[PDB]
Write a protein that binds this ligand. Sequence first.
Ligand SMILES: CCCCCN(C)CCC(O)(P(=O)(O)O)P(=O)(O)O
Ligand SMILES: CCCCCN(C)CCC(O)(P(=O)(O)O)P(=O)(O)O
Ligand SMILES: CCCCCN(C)CCC(O)(P(=O)(O)O)P(=O)(O)O
Ligand SMILES: CCCCCN(C)CCC(O)(P(=O)(O)O)P(=O)(O)O
Ligand SMILES: CCCCCN(C)CCC(O)(P(=O)(O)O)P(=O)(O)O
Ligand SMILES: CCCCCN(C)CCC(O)(P(=O)(O)O)P(=O)(O)O
Ligand SMILES: [Mg+2]
Ligand SMILES: [Mg+2]
Ligand SMILES: [Mg+2]
Ligand SMILES: [Mg+2]
Ligand SMILES: [Mg+2]
Ligand SMILES: [Mg+2]
Ligand SMILES: [Mg+2]
Ligand SMILES: [Mg+2]
Ligand SMILES: [Mg+2]
Ligand SMILES: [Mg+2]
Ligand SMILES: [Mg+2]
Ligand SMILES: [Mg+2]
Ligand SMILES: [Mg+2]
Ligand SMILES: [Mg+2]
Ligand SMILES: [Mg+2]
Ligand SMILES: [Mg+2]
Ligand SMILES: [Mg+2]
Lengths: 294, 287, 288, 290, 288, 286
Amino acid sequence: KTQETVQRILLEPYKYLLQLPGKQVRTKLSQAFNHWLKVPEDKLQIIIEVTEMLHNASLLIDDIEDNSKLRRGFPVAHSIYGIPSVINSANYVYFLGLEKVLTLDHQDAVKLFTRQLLELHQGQGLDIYWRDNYTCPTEEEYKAMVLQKTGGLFGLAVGLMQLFSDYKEDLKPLLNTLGLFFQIRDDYANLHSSENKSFCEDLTEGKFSFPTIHAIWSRPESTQVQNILRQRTENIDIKKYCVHYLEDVGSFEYTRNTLKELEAKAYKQIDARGGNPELVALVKHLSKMFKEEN
Amino acid sequence: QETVQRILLEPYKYLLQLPGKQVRTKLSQAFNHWLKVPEDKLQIIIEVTEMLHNASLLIDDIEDNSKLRRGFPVAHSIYGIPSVINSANYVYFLGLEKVLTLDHQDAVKLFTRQLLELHQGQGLDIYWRDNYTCPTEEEYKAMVLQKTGGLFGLAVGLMQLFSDYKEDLKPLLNTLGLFFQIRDDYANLHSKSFCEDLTEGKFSFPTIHAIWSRPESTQVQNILRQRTENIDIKKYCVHYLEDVGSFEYTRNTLKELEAKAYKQIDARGGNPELVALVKHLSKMFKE
Amino acid sequence: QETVQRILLEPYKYLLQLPGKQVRTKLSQAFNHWLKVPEDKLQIIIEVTEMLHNASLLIDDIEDNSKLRRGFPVAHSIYGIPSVINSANYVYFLGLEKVLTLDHQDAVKLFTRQLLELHQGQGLDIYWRDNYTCPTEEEYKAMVLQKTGGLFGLAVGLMQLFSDYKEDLKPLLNTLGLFFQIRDDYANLHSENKSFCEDLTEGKFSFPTIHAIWSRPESTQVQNILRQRTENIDIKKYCVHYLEDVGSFEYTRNTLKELEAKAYKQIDARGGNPELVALVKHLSKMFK
Amino acid sequence: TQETVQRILLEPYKYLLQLPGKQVRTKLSQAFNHWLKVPEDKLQIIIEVTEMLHNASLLIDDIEDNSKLRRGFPVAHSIYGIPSVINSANYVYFLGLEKVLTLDHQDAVKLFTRQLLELHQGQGLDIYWRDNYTCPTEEEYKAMVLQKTGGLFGLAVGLMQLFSDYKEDLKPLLNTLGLFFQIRDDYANLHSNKSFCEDLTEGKFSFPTIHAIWSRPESTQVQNILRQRTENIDIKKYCVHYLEDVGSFEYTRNTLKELEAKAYKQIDARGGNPELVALVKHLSKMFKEE
Amino acid sequence: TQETVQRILLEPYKYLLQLPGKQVRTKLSQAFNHWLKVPEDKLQIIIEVTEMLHNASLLIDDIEDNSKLRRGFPVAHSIYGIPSVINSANYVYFLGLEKVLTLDHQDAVKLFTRQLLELHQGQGLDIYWRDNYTCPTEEEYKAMVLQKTGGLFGLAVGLMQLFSDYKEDLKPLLNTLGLFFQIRDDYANLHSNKSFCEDLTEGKFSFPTIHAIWSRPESTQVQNILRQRTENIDIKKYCVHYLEDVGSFEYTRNTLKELEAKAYKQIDARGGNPELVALVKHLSKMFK
Amino acid sequence: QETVQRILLEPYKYLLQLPGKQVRTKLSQAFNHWLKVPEDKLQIIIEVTEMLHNASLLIDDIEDNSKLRRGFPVAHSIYGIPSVINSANYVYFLGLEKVLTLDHQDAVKLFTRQLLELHQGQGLDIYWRDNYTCPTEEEYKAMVLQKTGGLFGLAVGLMQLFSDYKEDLKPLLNTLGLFFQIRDDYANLHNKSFCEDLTEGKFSFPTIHAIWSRPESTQVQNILRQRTENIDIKKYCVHYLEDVGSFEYTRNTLKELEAKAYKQIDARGGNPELVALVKHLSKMFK
Ligand SMILES: CCCCCN(C)CCC(O)(P(=O)(O)O)P(=O)(O)O
Ligand SMILES: CCCCCN(C)CCC(O)(P(=O)(O)O)P(=O)(O)O
Ligand SMILES: CCCCCN(C)CCC(O)(P(=O)(O)O)P(=O)(O)O
Ligand SMILES: CCCCCN(C)CCC(O)(P(=O)(O)O)P(=O)(O)O
Ligand SMILES: CCCCCN(C)CCC(O)(P(=O)(O)O)P(=O)(O)O
Ligand SMILES: CCCCCN(C)CCC(O)(P(=O)(O)O)P(=O)(O)O
Ligand SMILES: [Mg+2]
Ligand SMILES: [Mg+2]
Ligand SMILES: [Mg+2]
Ligand SMILES: [Mg+2]
Ligand SMILES: [Mg+2]
Ligand SMILES: [Mg+2]
Ligand SMILES: [Mg+2]
Ligand SMILES: [Mg+2]
Ligand SMILES: [Mg+2]
Ligand SMILES: [Mg+2]
Ligand SMILES: [Mg+2]
Ligand SMILES: [Mg+2]
Ligand SMILES: [Mg+2]
Ligand SMILES: [Mg+2]
Ligand SMILES: [Mg+2]
Ligand SMILES: [Mg+2]
Ligand SMILES: [Mg+2]
């Protein structure tokens, strides 16, 4: 059993990332959705653990794929332990999550786990494909990818909960709204505001995110943003210049407007389902970020 | 229009061009001499095995900074590291999806256990290499059983779920796992490109012997730490390995493993296909 | 002062050490079969043309990260990129200066028109490569007519200023421009001039790789290899094997054989030209 | 793809036009037009030619000098790439040549050719010395500055003079203004466009560093620091301290104060020019205090 | 001509003489001369030898450690280049040997040789552990520090004692002061004249990081951060936060206060020394 | 303990595997034909000489960014620059320690003088290369006399402290020093990999000739400034050197030095071993 220290070696990058929980929005979202689903506490606890394990593991992988520098205000794990250690450690946690999903003792849990992880990797693969092949998505293509990349894990937690629930109404349209809302909110924070990532890391990554997609499509006579993204640059002045352009062509105002529409849509969709005070409060809390800047 | 799936799989499809499936086919057939798996289950198991193995190679080439595999560029040198990580991980879960089609209550548990063991072996190999702590020979062997036994044990274990043959194949699987890996360490330095294991910096069976058997020198550790592509440094380090007897020691370890495999195969009633495969693979360390 | 000019010209004189085929002069001599330009004007026109040609090669090797030209190291790998840019651009305007000595009211306007054409072709070639958008075959050919036909048209157009010859040479110049560039795309990947498949390291879309990309749209292997900007010999050999396997080299050879045949028909349409015929035939040994 | 091809080829050029600096060029045109009284149609073309050639030359210069910022903006090639900007700048050179033809003057191209050859001779000497590690004497530097800056200076004024009845010799004044503008640019760069002392990162021999090198020949630290091509702020701060301590900044201020006085003398010798005097005075605040 | 040769060879050395820290060595010379009362002619030579050897060893040490700043100035090799600074420092070593001979004492050269061998054994262990990724124990670290600092400490004092009537054993005090100076450095480097946490960029095992490594053996965080040899400010800030949280800075302050108290006790055992006490007291403001 | 000593000396011990001890012993033996040094003193002097020479090569390989020496990887390419600097410098002072055991009043003073001369030559060589000022041919030779005479004069000078042979060997040591260095300059472009001198960017005898004899070209200066490993640039510059006659000029200089060596040896009563050694070394350019 002592030889099992190997477990400590393999998990150290994972435990490092856990040194500072970001939010437990997926945990708090699970609790909010249990207002409808009324899942027995023992099953719910396992589902939350699986969900957060996969979430944190995917952040380890995502930061490697994106050449990110900070997460949750801390250096990314692979910048300390190295990329090879963190790939293996994150992937190890994927299969520890599969192991935990088996303890739910439901014939369909693994099938749902599989379905959602395939969707997550399709979303992530599209995000990477567009960025690294320098082909900006349309706004609609971006949204559809976000539903897979971000809604994927939402749908895993909620889908697993429904396996143990008598509530059989379709929650997928609301999950879709929350997935888009969460990602665009994150796209906005990364370029408009440190607290999570360092200064405009999305620009250094070269990713097409909601603000830059708007700037690219709404001013087609300029290729400035595409070229800056292609430079994969860390230069603070180029990044500051590109943020000024996004501001001047209304990309940040357009992103705030989209977020305000998504928040309003969430409230309507929650009201159509009989209400949910916990979910309303969570959406409202997440929406302070794009409302009072001055 | 669902051209997405081809984009996500292209690094995987690229790797399928590479030599190496035949030996995996012969291993399936050789073990089927005992297990006599029904063709429909056997076909699914081979597909699962091929997906997981190849996906793990895509990842391993990134973890090891390799340039060539079986004479082909590594996939991430064409498609990029971010694309290949995601594509390899996608295939892991397509492999999980396929094992579900086996329609056996224990297939997923065995899949999970074996993938966990594969990652424990890989993690130790990476930890030692990148934290500059050379393992003992016993630690290396224990790690190899995890690193190689993972998919070895998955393929055979899945076959046994559908077999009346219930004898213990694990000791033989252990011998073959050590045999394959040490033979691979030996081939790498004794003639991927020229001595790529030295560029990777990994502690392999020959360098582990040289490090421990000549403790007054830090030559090998320092060369591995350089992570160098320099051919003269590599040629220098191979000559040292030769002079302190590391290649002779590895050949002898391999000859013991070959003999043990034959002993264990006979203890299981014989297996002409496996004997011929072991004998053929053992020409690599013979003059 | 004379020593200032030697300092400024040293990268240019360095490149001139290399023995070029001077095909543009031989083409000038062949086209003079029709145009019959007095030798004094012709010598000036030839000098302008080779000056601009060699200066544009200095710039092109910088824009393309090339390592060898005509079997010698590129000038900027010896003297540095800043020195070679200024020296090459210096020669552009020395070419303008010599163009003035032709003492013809229309010489400068033609010089200007053709260099605007050269930079539009070159700019498109650079734009596609560095923005990772592969051109269609038709788009590629049209830019080649500007990039490579541009300088052909400068030499012949200047000659026509001093000629009574009234036939239209533009269709033949277009064929020779396409023929020369595709022949060069082919040599770079199939065959000294450049090092091993430098076009793949540059990441440019050339006739063979354009064919492989469009004719096998379900694979993105070539686009990705070009995007890597790699010097790895094994990746390059792999990419050449693919081009061969999907018929890209056979397709390029057939395109070249059609272009050679078209040149002969167009030369016959202008009364014949033994010198130009022999030159096209000589250049066509590169394939077959 | 119809007119959008031109937009693609011209985008690095259009990007640079966002940058402050045209106002001073406008004020220079207006100041010299006080004497030259150029008809508006010819003047408008000449200003267009000058803005094209000047900006195209800055695009090339930032590549040649490995600059990162110009007038607080990213250099064009750090956004669009070096290959794109080279071709785009050179394209603009010949669009400038095309525009020069519309002046319909037999001598316009001869002047264009002469002045662009001068520009490239100055630039080549500036690059040659820097990248071959041979520091010029002050006199060699000044002669190079007359070519490097006089090139477009003399083109603007020379083209204007082709359409003017004012035929007095402006070259001595253009030479003074050329030295004045460049040395003021060397001084501002190290004394505080570019980020912190970018000239040191470029490694160029500028007026202050030339003085320090020649006036303290028993030390080679400045040559060695320039050779480092460094972005290290501490090395740059150290080298500024050395220049200060050996009096190179005081020497540069004195040279600039002499040039300002000479400009006024040469302007008075040409009958006066309140606009040019006011521009020189405003530009000369850069090397003063009180 | 030779005059200029000497200036060429000595310029990296003369550059370093601009840097602060001359005063501390002067204050140490005078404080120990309170006991040793060295004849002025010998003392001046010894001070010169001490300054030559110390500065030369700092020139070399900055190359070995990839440092950027020393005492707020750029390291010499960042201006003149590593090859120039190596040769210049080594030249000064033997100019220091040449000057030691002018002491005209049979044992001066024997003491010089012994102490420089001492210094290089300390330096070699410091470099060996760092670059072979083997963290020393606290005891091993202290023993290495006694050699690295005792090298020049013992040379200066040993040479002074050759010409002195004071024959008491100063080695125990030199050992304490050597530990005091190095650990006070280790502390200043990470807790505040180098730029921000250069020791982390160097990857060296210093007193605070040695404590963190051994006191939390289930973590490899510090070893991995040191292995990165990073200039990333956020990683450095993270590693300083970690050191604080596991008590490494508190532990270092404790060692420093024990060393300070021991120095005072050892100084009093040697008859007192107001100058040395005041210097130790001033240096001890850095903690508590 | 003693394992510290092994740690500190490992880069030095690595270099001892390399060839070239043979030539140095042959040089010691040839000069002992005149000097007839007592065996106990001779052994210490040989030991001192090998320590200082090998330590100086460790340092030189760092200063010169070399890849190979005598067909082996340079020590710092295995152990790292920091380890090799300290180990080489450690051996310098172990060499001083061993010199003390000669028990001669003038030994350390001679040791000091010669080590200062070595560093003056080395420093000038480095100064010219890294400040991009090519020496004149005469400046180069004077620098070579310091760089090589340092250890030549140390070995021979220490021997003479214990010798009745008191004739002036310095003019001969000067010629042999030039012969050795210029021959190595010649071999490098005509041990190390392909033209490592060009990668180092140093001014050596062939490139100095090419630079001064064709002053209208800066091609060689620029190639050296690139500090390049590109084989095509190296091949280009060697062919340039051939075409402007630098290799023939270097060969002629070497044969003049060989002939002068023979005359200077005969002026000292003859020395069959030294003549035979010079003759063998002259096969390289004949
Ligand atoms: C590896 C599986 C992908 C899962 C991705 N998660 C949504 C997190 C990634 C992000 O949200 P993050 O901003 O990096 O945290 P992204 O903006 O890159 O989409
Ligand atoms: C991610 C899991 C990878 C499993 C790796 N297999 C052992 C094969 C890889 C090797 O055998 P290979 O020689 O690289 O193919 P390695 O020497 O790296 O261990
Ligand atoms: C600056 C204008 C560029 C002119 C370059 N010539 C057209 C042809 C140059 C080429 O053929 P080359 O093979 O590099 O000589 P490219 O295919 O790169 O364009
Ligand atoms: C290619 C022609 C470039 C002409 C350059 N002008 C002198 C202005 C450029 C400068 O003043 P700038 O400071 O870069 O704007 P430089 O210091 O480089 O000389
Ligand atoms: C006090 C006498 C010892 C001489 C100093 N050593 C050479 C090293 C200098 C150091 O203290 P420094 O902080 O770099 O100056 P190091 O940390 O590298 O050990
Ligand atoms: C400090 C080292 C001084 C000793 C150097 N010797 C001349 C031999 C070194 C050489 O001959 P080598 O060819 O590198 O061995 P170099 O050309 O560099 O001078
Ligand atoms: Mg991300
Ligand atoms: Mg991402
Ligand atoms: Mg591997
Ligand atoms: Mg591996
Ligand atoms: Mg292997
Ligand atoms: Mg080209
Ligand atoms: Mg090109
Ligand atoms: Mg071409
Ligand atoms: Mg500039
Ligand atoms: Mg400039
Ligand atoms: Mg300037
Ligand atoms: Mg230090
Ligand atoms: Mg140190
Ligand atoms: Mg320190
Ligand atoms: Mg050398
Ligand atoms: Mg040398
Ligand atoms: Mg040499």
